[PDB]
């Protein structure tokens, strides 16, 4: 004798549609940074109502459309306006605002992500927001470009000896790594290749200049200084994950590609050291040659 109480089910479109208009208005108000007045119980109750009557497709499509429209029309124009000057700060501010808005929206709609998303096997609210931001902001035709040139520019300035905002570089690297949603795919795709290419070219030029400039001891000192500089830059500005490819290029260019130059070096070579009988030079040469295979 369970005696299950009866309960009605209704799908009146106009009533359903008005709920959607209210939810869209609330989401737009949140995106405009005006959440201090919006209620919580009403919105969560409405979101629960839309999932109980099997209308999740409408909710998901509307959320996607609203998020895309707002992000485009309120971020892309702003970034293009700030394209010339104050580029990193506005991008970081937009990223933080987008993250906060998305986390609040996810907080409102936990029922949708707990039922509908797992039922139909789609991306959650947070992942959807990250995907939209990656597709429509960071990976734009020109924004990605200017980002790469300015990043390589501050890298070159730091290599020369200038002072750059390491915090901004670190924040940009962290944002890029997060934007993959699983790992470093986007980080490898958009940032790693130009950085490695420019670093390789710069190190080849520096190695050629050092070889044409002085003897082997000066080359050893220069390569040690470069190693210290790159290991300080990766540990403070860049991400720790991009360490092995950098040292590989350093060894293959400043050491390996000049190994013959160290083989035939005069007044500082192995033959010169053996004839002089010195030991500090031999130790320095052994330390330099240990890193370079063969």
């Amino acid at each position: 004798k369970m005696r299950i109480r009866a309960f009605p089910m209704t799908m009146d479109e106009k009533y359903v549609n008005s709920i959607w208009d209210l939810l869209k208005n609330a989401i737009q108000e949140i995106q405009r940074k005006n959440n201090s007045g919006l209620s919580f119980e009403e919105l969560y109750r409405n979101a629960y109502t839309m999932v109980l009557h099997k209308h999740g497709e409408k909710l998901y499509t509307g959320l996607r459309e609203v998020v895309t429209e707002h992000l485009i029309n309120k971020v892309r124009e702003d970034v293009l306006n700030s394209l010339n000057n104050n580029f990193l700060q506005t991008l970081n501010q937009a990223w933080n605002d987008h993250q906060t808005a998305m986390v609040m929206i996810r907080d409102i709609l936990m029922y949708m992500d707990r039922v509908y998303v797992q039922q139909n096997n789609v991306e959650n609210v947070y992942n959807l927001g990250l995907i939209i931001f990656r597709d429509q902001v960071v990976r734009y035709g020109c924004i990605r470009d200017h980002l790469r040139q300015t990043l390589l520019d501050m890298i070159a300035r730091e290599r020369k000896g200038e002072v750059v905002d390491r915090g901004a570089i670190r924040n940009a690297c962290q944002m890029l790594m997060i934007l993959g949603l699983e790992g470093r795919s986007v980080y490898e795709e958009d940032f790693e290749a130009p950085f490695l290419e420019m670093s390789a070219e710069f190190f080849q030029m520096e190695s050629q200049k050092f070889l044409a400039e002085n003897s082997a001891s000066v080359y050893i000192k220069k390569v040690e200084a470069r190693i210290n500089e790159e290991i300080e830059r990766v540990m403070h500005c860049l991400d720790k994950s991009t360490e092995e490819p950098i040292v590989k290029v350093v060894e293959r260019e400043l050491i390996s590609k000049h190994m013959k130059t160290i083989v035939e070096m005069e007044n500082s070579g192995l033959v010169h050291m053996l004839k002089n009988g010195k030991t500090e030079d031999l130790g320095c040469m052994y330390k330099l040659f240990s890193r370079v295979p063969n």
Binding site: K1, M2, R3, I4, S36, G37, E41, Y44, R45, Y48
Partner: protein
């Protein structure tokens, strides 16, 4: 040092203190108004208990600056129960407010209370409101309830079929239940009656379901009577085909079909044939199985059981067949006849094979035929490898063996027979032959860890593992407690758990990654072995398995899916 401690009774003390504070009615800071009634609570406990409250009290919305909070669409008693559970971690249910509590729990997305409510409702499941339960579990999308609801349906089919709600059930669900190999039934007559009741009115009695009906499950006389009583229809043609198939039991493993199988999961190891040393080693004609559901030595009567021992057991289409079989206990003489048991048909018909001048040989069933290599004579070495034809169950010729062996070790490793150990003449050979069925010739294989004879081979991790053995050629006629797995895939004698008991020619049986060895003759003990060792390759744990009531040597056993009634009795 910097040792760190961690207590375990701190959380309960904290909860008890919180409950005492709530009972004292002090330090309250939030009031919830539900349908017009006020409840006092603490903000932090609610915000740190569930996710609905966490967003409401910590998201940053207006609720930061409200003393009273309106709650709509919920029962006051439901909130009282929820708060009691939060403050106590003990939830008291009843038969009146269970629906309100369940709907409130589903509203706030709290898993533990949802699971408790579901368990209580199933424990108080009502026959007259099962559809009202499916509706409730469907609107709220409770995928964790529907599965065991269907499990309940498949174990009480007979009682529910009488009720008209069985006709009221959806066709898809009924078809899914009928096709499932879990219905608690004895004969296909009940299935036919249920199909008729679903496809016709109760008064009328007094198509699609027939697709799930196992026609061969009925008797030949029953099938003939149904065909005679049936009107001209393709159902009659199907019944005639089923009767004809039942009239060809000799081709039972060559006439397999989805409706020609049983409906159970009772995979157990059944020992049949062989010689039991107590009280005299003779070819037994009874099946001594090790029932895990009963967990004991179950007894059965194998029909048409040949007087053979250590015969190769082949299990195809839920039908067991015996090939060769040395009868050195009753006199060394090869038997060309073969005996077959049909657990699927609940009977056994001796499907005799052709001339197979080999003993202690096993054939791996690849396609319509079965490939076998090496082999042994009645009491000595032999190289007459004989293949099998399951369609005619005929023992035909096979590829020649590399060398003659006696009581050798052999295992089908990934569709390729591997033969190791064995006794060429009197001398125990250590050469390994990899007779791949695809290559139809011997190939290189890992050498046996023990260069002995009469050593059984098991299929551990899809590898021919050699363990036990009892022969003087191993150094002495003593128990070999060292077991190494001759992994042909790795091609090496990988380390394995040492064998607790050393006994040569022991029958192996793999039951859920547990390759136990039982029976055989132990040279160290000077008699047959009546103990088994339960070891798992994955778990690496070896202990004492089931012990037989009588020591046996040169016996045969195989793991197969038996009828559910047999496992239940």
């Amino acid at each position: 040092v910097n040792n760190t401690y961690r207590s375990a009774q701190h959380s309960q003390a904290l909860l008890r203190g919180l409950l005492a504070l709530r009972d004292s009615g002090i330090l309250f800071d939030v009031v919830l108004v539900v349908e017009g009634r006020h409840i006092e609570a603490h903000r932090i406990l609610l915000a740190a208990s569930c996710d609905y409250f966490r967003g409401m009290f910590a998201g940053g919305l207006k609720e930061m600056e409200q003393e009273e909070v309106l709650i709509h669409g919920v029962s006051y008693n439901a909130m009282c129960q929820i708060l009691h559970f939060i403050y106590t971690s003990e939830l008291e249910l009843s038969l009146s407010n269970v629906q309100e509590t369940l709907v409130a729990a589903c509203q706030l997305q709290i898993p533990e209370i949802i699971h408790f409510c579901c368990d209580f409702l199933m424990s108080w499941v009502d026959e007259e409101n099962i559809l009202d339960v499916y509706r409730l579990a469907e609107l709220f999308d409770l995928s964790r309830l529907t599965e065991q609801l269907d499990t309940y349906i498949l174990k009480n089919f007979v009682a529910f079929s009488r009720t008209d709600k069985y006709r009221q059930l959806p066709l898809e669900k009924v078809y899914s239940l009928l096709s499932s190999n879990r219905l608690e039934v004895s004969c296909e007559t009940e299935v036919y009656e249920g199909a008729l009741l679903y496809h016709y009115s109760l008064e009328q009695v007094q198509p699609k379901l027939l697709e799930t009906v196992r026609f061969p499950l009925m008797e030949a006389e029953v099938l003939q009577r149904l065909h005679d009583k049936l009107d001209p229809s393709p159902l009659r043609d199907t019944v005639a085909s089923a009767l004809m198939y039942h009239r060809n039991e000799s081709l039972q493993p060559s006439l397999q079909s989805p409706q020609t199988e049983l409906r159970s999961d009772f995979q157990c190891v059944v020992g049949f044939g062989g010689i039991h040393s107590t009280p005299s080693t003779v070819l037994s004609d009874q099946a001594k199985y090790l029932n895990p559901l009963l967990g004991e030595w179950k007894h059965f009567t194998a029909s048409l059981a040949p007087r053979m021992s250590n015969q190769g057991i082949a299990v195809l289409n839920n039908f067991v067949y015996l090939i060769g079989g040395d009868n050195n206990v009753q006199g060394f003489r090869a038997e060309s006849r073969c005996w077959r048991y049909d657990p699927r048909h609940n009977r056994w018909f001796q499907i005799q094979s052709l001339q197979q001048e080999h003993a202690d040989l096993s054939v791996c069933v690849v396609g319509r035929y079965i490939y076998a290599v090496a082999g042994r004579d009645y009491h000595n070495d032999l190289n007459a490898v004989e293949r099998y034809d399951p369609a005619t169950n005929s023992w035909a010729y096979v590829a020649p063996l590399k060398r003659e062996v006696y009581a050798h070790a052999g295992a089908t490793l990934e569709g390729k027979m591997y033969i190791t150990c064995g006794r060429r003449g009197e001398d125990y050979l250590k050469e390994t032959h990899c007779y791949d069925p695809g290559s139809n010739t011997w190939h290189t294989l890992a050498d046996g860890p023990v260069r002995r004879a009469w050593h059984g081979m098991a299929t551990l991790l899809n590898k021919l593992y050699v363990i036990g053995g009892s022969n003087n050629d191993a150094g002495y006629r003593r128990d070999v407690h060292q077991v190494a797995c001759y992994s042909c895939t790795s091609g090496q004698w990988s380390s394995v758990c040492p064998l607790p008991a050393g006994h040569g020619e022991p029958g192996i049986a793999v039951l859920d990654n547990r390759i136990y060895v039982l029976g055989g003759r132990s040279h160290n003990r000077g008699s047959r072995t009546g103990y088994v060792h339960i070891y798992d390759v994955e778990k690496d744990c070896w202990e004492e398995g089931p012990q037989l009531d009588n020591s046996i040597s040169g016996l045969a056993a195989c793991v197969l899916t038996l009828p559910r009634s047999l496992l239940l009795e």
